[PDB]
mmCIF file of C-alpha atoms and ligand atoms in Angstrom:
data_model
loop_
_atom_site.group_PDB
_atom_site.id
_atom_site.type_symbol
_atom_site.label_atom_id
_atom_site.label_comp_id
_atom_site.label_asym_id
_atom_site.label_seq_id
_atom_site.Cartn_x
_atom_site.Cartn_y
_atom_site.Cartn_z
ATOM 1 C CA UNK A 1 -0.219 -0.175 0.031
ATOM 2 C CA UNK A 2 1.691 3.131 -1.251
ATOM 3 C CA UNK A 3 1.022 6.131 0.728
ATOM 4 C CA UNK A 4 0.327 9.514 -0.523
ATOM 5 C CA UNK A 5 1.598 12.546 1.365
ATOM 6 C CA UNK A 6 -0.170 15.635 0.467
ATOM 7 C CA UNK A 7 2.128 18.636 1.396
ATOM 8 C CA UNK A 8 1.051 22.402 1.470
ATOM 9 C CA UNK A 9 3.747 25.419 0.774
ATOM 10 C CA UNK A 10 2.658 28.222 2.639
ATOM 11 C CA UNK A 11 4.035 31.646 3.522
ATOM 12 C CA UNK A 12 3.650 35.329 2.498
ATOM 13 C CA UNK A 13 4.082 36.412 -1.152
ATOM 14 C CA UNK A 14 7.600 36.575 -2.249
ATOM 15 C CA UNK A 15 9.383 34.295 0.018
ATOM 16 C CA UNK A 16 10.145 31.618 -2.606
ATOM 17 C CA UNK A 17 7.515 29.117 -2.482
ATOM 18 C CA UNK A 18 7.410 28.675 -6.069
ATOM 19 C CA UNK A 19 11.054 28.814 -6.650
ATOM 20 C CA UNK A 20 11.615 26.095 -3.863
ATOM 21 C CA UNK A 21 8.806 23.782 -5.495
ATOM 22 C CA UNK A 22 10.011 24.152 -8.972
ATOM 23 C CA UNK A 23 13.667 23.579 -7.802
ATOM 24 C CA UNK A 24 12.249 20.361 -6.198
ATOM 25 C CA UNK A 25 10.302 19.265 -9.038
ATOM 26 C CA UNK A 26 12.210 20.334 -12.208
ATOM 27 C CA UNK A 27 15.795 20.830 -10.601
ATOM 28 C CA UNK A 28 16.034 24.409 -12.006
ATOM 29 C CA UNK A 29 15.749 27.962 -10.596
ATOM 30 C CA UNK A 30 13.065 29.828 -12.186
ATOM 31 C CA UNK A 31 13.173 33.614 -11.183
ATOM 32 C CA UNK A 32 10.307 35.818 -10.852
ATOM 33 C CA UNK A 33 7.714 33.178 -11.178
ATOM 34 C CA UNK A 34 4.105 34.618 -11.638
ATOM 35 C CA UNK A 35 3.231 35.739 -8.124
ATOM 36 C CA UNK A 36 -0.431 34.728 -8.474
ATOM 37 C CA UNK A 37 -0.149 31.414 -10.146
ATOM 38 C CA UNK A 38 -0.902 28.334 -7.882
ATOM 39 C CA UNK A 39 0.197 24.976 -9.211
ATOM 40 C CA UNK A 40 0.097 21.502 -7.684
ATOM 41 C CA UNK A 41 2.728 18.851 -8.465
ATOM 42 C CA UNK A 42 2.307 15.074 -8.125
ATOM 43 C CA UNK A 43 4.986 12.373 -8.442
ATOM 44 C CA UNK A 44 6.077 8.825 -7.245
ATOM 45 C CA UNK A 45 9.503 9.198 -5.303
ATOM 46 C CA UNK A 46 11.688 7.386 -2.948
ATOM 47 C CA UNK A 47 12.466 8.857 0.430
ATOM 48 C CA UNK A 48 14.692 6.715 2.754
ATOM 49 C CA UNK A 49 14.140 3.550 0.715
ATOM 50 C CA UNK A 50 10.285 3.759 0.890
ATOM 51 C CA UNK A 51 8.221 4.738 -2.097
ATOM 52 C CA UNK A 52 5.433 7.259 -1.603
ATOM 53 C CA UNK A 53 3.346 9.742 -3.851
ATOM 54 C CA UNK A 54 3.779 13.392 -2.941
ATOM 55 C CA UNK A 55 1.112 15.490 -3.930
ATOM 56 C CA UNK A 56 2.184 19.077 -3.340
ATOM 57 C CA UNK A 57 0.446 22.308 -3.649
ATOM 58 C CA UNK A 58 2.470 25.797 -4.183
ATOM 59 C CA UNK A 59 0.022 28.118 -2.852
ATOM 60 C CA UNK A 60 -0.171 31.609 -4.393
ATOM 61 C CA UNK A 61 -2.685 34.507 -4.256
ATOM 62 C CA UNK A 62 -5.878 34.787 -2.522
ATOM 63 C CA UNK A 63 -7.638 31.807 -0.690
ATOM 64 C CA UNK A 64 -11.172 33.030 -2.221
ATOM 65 C CA UNK A 65 -9.817 32.735 -5.574
ATOM 66 C CA UNK A 66 -8.110 29.494 -5.367
ATOM 67 C CA UNK A 67 -10.134 26.215 -6.630
ATOM 68 C CA UNK A 68 -7.841 24.097 -4.688
ATOM 69 C CA UNK A 69 -6.850 25.736 -1.428
ATOM 70 C CA UNK A 70 -9.537 24.691 0.859
ATOM 71 C CA UNK A 71 -9.186 20.831 0.185
ATOM 72 C CA UNK A 72 -5.423 21.036 0.520
ATOM 73 C CA UNK A 73 -5.522 22.838 3.732
ATOM 74 C CA UNK A 74 -8.248 20.568 5.160
ATOM 75 C CA UNK A 75 -6.619 17.103 4.155
ATOM 76 C CA UNK A 76 -3.017 18.013 3.942
ATOM 77 C CA UNK A 77 -0.521 15.727 5.642
ATOM 78 C CA UNK A 78 1.975 18.317 6.259
ATOM 79 C CA UNK A 79 2.972 21.721 5.719
ATOM 80 C CA UNK A 80 6.236 23.831 4.924
ATOM 81 C CA UNK A 81 5.896 27.237 6.297
ATOM 82 C CA UNK A 82 8.173 29.411 4.415
ATOM 83 C CA UNK A 83 9.640 32.920 5.070
ATOM 84 C CA UNK A 84 12.406 34.990 3.417
ATOM 85 C CA UNK A 85 15.430 35.782 5.652
ATOM 86 C CA UNK A 86 15.167 39.179 3.892
ATOM 87 C CA UNK A 87 11.633 40.104 4.706
ATOM 88 C CA UNK A 88 10.946 40.637 8.437
ATOM 89 C CA UNK A 89 7.205 40.777 7.944
ATOM 90 C CA UNK A 90 7.265 37.390 6.128
ATOM 91 C CA UNK A 91 8.897 36.064 9.481
ATOM 92 C CA UNK A 92 6.294 37.671 11.677
ATOM 93 C CA UNK A 93 3.764 36.161 9.701
ATOM 94 C CA UNK A 94 4.913 32.780 10.180
ATOM 95 C CA UNK A 95 2.868 32.801 13.721
ATOM 96 C CA UNK A 96 -0.303 33.692 11.249
ATOM 97 C CA UNK A 97 0.145 30.544 9.054
ATOM 98 C CA UNK A 98 0.977 28.458 12.267
ATOM 99 C CA UNK A 99 -2.391 29.530 13.924
ATOM 100 C CA UNK A 100 -4.246 28.948 10.738
ATOM 101 C CA UNK A 101 -2.892 25.355 10.534
ATOM 102 C CA UNK A 102 -3.596 24.517 13.858
ATOM 103 C CA UNK A 103 -7.214 26.027 13.541
ATOM 104 C CA UNK A 104 -7.871 24.169 10.219
ATOM 105 C CA UNK A 105 -6.480 20.875 11.367
ATOM 106 C CA UNK A 106 -8.103 21.278 14.677
ATOM 107 C CA UNK A 107 -4.951 19.772 16.610
ATOM 108 C CA UNK A 108 -2.358 21.195 19.115
ATOM 109 C CA UNK A 109 0.327 20.352 16.561
ATOM 110 C CA UNK A 110 0.644 19.307 13.215
ATOM 111 C CA UNK A 111 3.560 18.185 10.930
ATOM 112 C CA UNK A 112 5.177 21.167 9.806
ATOM 113 C CA UNK A 113 8.868 22.645 8.995
ATOM 114 C CA UNK A 114 9.894 26.040 9.299
ATOM 115 C CA UNK A 115 11.787 27.021 6.165
ATOM 116 C CA UNK A 116 13.978 30.140 6.161
ATOM 117 C CA UNK A 117 14.470 30.890 2.493
ATOM 118 C CA UNK A 118 16.909 33.027 0.475
ATOM 119 C CA UNK A 119 20.079 32.341 2.823
ATOM 120 C CA UNK A 120 22.183 33.114 -0.254
ATOM 121 C CA UNK A 121 21.566 36.515 0.604
ATOM 122 C CA UNK A 122 23.983 38.037 2.895
ATOM 123 C CA UNK A 123 23.651 42.077 2.884
ATOM 124 C CA UNK A 124 19.978 41.797 2.763
ATOM 125 C CA UNK A 125 19.346 39.318 5.410
ATOM 126 C CA UNK A 126 17.088 40.829 8.385
ATOM 127 C CA UNK A 127 16.188 37.588 10.223
ATOM 128 C CA UNK A 128 19.367 35.893 11.843
ATOM 129 C CA UNK A 129 19.589 32.140 12.223
ATOM 130 C CA UNK A 130 18.937 32.266 15.725
ATOM 131 C CA UNK A 131 15.871 34.287 15.287
ATOM 132 C CA UNK A 132 14.540 31.372 13.106
ATOM 133 C CA UNK A 133 15.811 28.684 15.223
ATOM 134 C CA UNK A 134 14.205 30.157 18.590
ATOM 135 C CA UNK A 135 10.928 30.360 16.744
ATOM 136 C CA UNK A 136 11.053 26.873 15.422
ATOM 137 C CA UNK A 137 11.824 25.809 19.144
ATOM 138 C CA UNK A 138 8.844 27.801 20.346
ATOM 139 C CA UNK A 139 6.846 25.956 18.090
ATOM 140 C CA UNK A 140 8.583 22.531 18.529
ATOM 141 C CA UNK A 141 9.051 22.108 14.775
ATOM 142 C CA UNK A 142 12.152 21.774 12.706
ATOM 143 C CA UNK A 143 14.223 24.532 11.270
ATOM 144 C CA UNK A 144 15.870 24.383 7.837
ATOM 145 C CA UNK A 145 17.492 27.095 5.643
ATOM 146 C CA UNK A 146 17.156 27.078 2.032
ATOM 147 C CA UNK A 147 18.122 28.609 -1.278
ATOM 148 C CA UNK A 148 16.322 28.238 -4.516
ATOM 149 C CA UNK A 149 19.131 29.691 -6.401
ATOM 150 C CA UNK A 150 21.870 27.400 -8.300
ATOM 151 C CA UNK A 151 23.286 25.634 -6.514
ATOM 152 C CA UNK A 152 20.236 24.991 -4.622
ATOM 153 C CA UNK A 153 20.615 24.424 -0.710
ATOM 154 C CA UNK A 154 18.601 22.134 1.231
ATOM 155 C CA UNK A 155 15.639 21.939 -1.276
ATOM 156 C CA UNK A 156 15.343 18.153 -1.472
ATOM 157 C CA UNK A 157 16.215 17.980 2.204
ATOM 158 C CA UNK A 158 13.116 20.126 3.154
ATOM 159 C CA UNK A 159 10.600 18.269 1.298
ATOM 160 C CA UNK A 160 12.097 14.808 2.487
ATOM 161 C CA UNK A 161 12.296 16.178 6.115
ATOM 162 C CA UNK A 162 8.648 17.052 5.944
ATOM 163 C CA UNK A 163 7.633 13.370 4.967
ATOM 164 C CA UNK A 164 10.161 12.196 7.736
ATOM 165 C CA UNK A 165 8.284 14.252 10.369
ATOM 166 C CA UNK A 166 4.763 12.637 8.887
ATOM 167 C CA UNK A 167 6.335 9.179 9.272
ATOM 168 C CA UNK A 168 7.784 9.929 12.748
ATOM 169 C CA UNK A 169 4.642 11.667 14.285
HETATM 170 N N1 LIG B 1 18.282 35.351 -3.842
HETATM 171 C C1 LIG B 1 17.125 34.477 -3.957
HETATM 172 N N2 LIG B 1 16.085 34.777 -4.619
HETATM 173 C C2 LIG B 1 14.780 33.940 -4.245
HETATM 174 C C3 LIG B 1 14.918 32.743 -3.947
HETATM 175 N N3 LIG B 1 13.707 32.167 -4.078
HETATM 176 C C4 LIG B 1 13.188 32.998 -4.664
HETATM 177 N N4 LIG B 1 13.752 34.020 -5.077
HETATM 178 C C5 LIG B 1 13.178 35.304 -5.860
HETATM 179 O O1 LIG B 1 12.362 35.878 -4.879
HETATM 180 C C6 LIG B 1 11.214 36.432 -5.446
HETATM 181 C C7 LIG B 1 9.999 35.682 -5.168
HETATM 182 O O2 LIG B 1 10.116 34.257 -5.587
HETATM 183 P P1 LIG B 1 8.778 33.275 -5.596
HETATM 184 O O3 LIG B 1 9.367 32.036 -5.855
HETATM 185 O O4 LIG B 1 7.943 34.023 -6.769
HETATM 186 O O5 LIG B 1 8.017 33.361 -4.347
HETATM 187 P P2 LIG B 1 6.577 33.099 -3.785
HETATM 188 O O6 LIG B 1 5.781 34.504 -4.200
HETATM 189 O O7 LIG B 1 6.520 32.592 -2.489
HETATM 190 O O8 LIG B 1 5.945 31.963 -4.851
HETATM 191 C C8 LIG B 1 11.491 36.240 -6.990
HETATM 192 O O9 LIG B 1 12.218 37.176 -7.517
HETATM 193 C C9 LIG B 1 12.444 35.061 -7.125
HETATM 194 O O10 LIG B 1 13.255 34.917 -8.205
HETATM 195 C C10 LIG B 1 16.191 32.421 -3.118
HETATM 196 O O11 LIG B 1 16.442 31.355 -2.652
HETATM 197 N N5 LIG B 1 17.143 33.076 -3.275
HETATM 198 MG MG1 LIG B 2 4.589 31.689 -6.204
#
């Protein structure tokens, strides 16, 4: 019985949700991907020598204009909450997404990873590693730093780690 893991990528506009998801599925960096296009992606893949189907929603735009958002939020098996280390507001807003997930899933905790994207940027970085890690510690969830830019950092690891969390819960 091959399981499906339905994964939902959430976070403020501009943090790199699309770039990360495209890097994962297509192994290329696509800059400035249409900000409002919401795509899902489905593939069989092997993680830690166990096959699964990943059904991934790259969220975009307003929930009230999305055909698929409601079902993915309600039935998702795990979430990536992404912020950009160059956008302090996107970091602050992690709390909004965290609350939203726990409200919709109606649980005290739920599989999720905190993803600090754009760590290839140094001068523009406004959120420190320690700020990210403390937030993850507060929520009792894993923390990972990523870059979707070539060569990508921790992109496969992020999606795989979310699957690992779902399997470990
Ligand atoms: N330097 C850098 N820029 C990135 C990275 N990921 C995305 N971007 C850029 O950040 C902007 C927003 O990315 P996008 O994937 O559209 O974010 P989304 O709105 O969350 O889907 C675009 O200009 C991207 O080219 C990254 O890891 N590093
Ligand atoms: Mg996008």
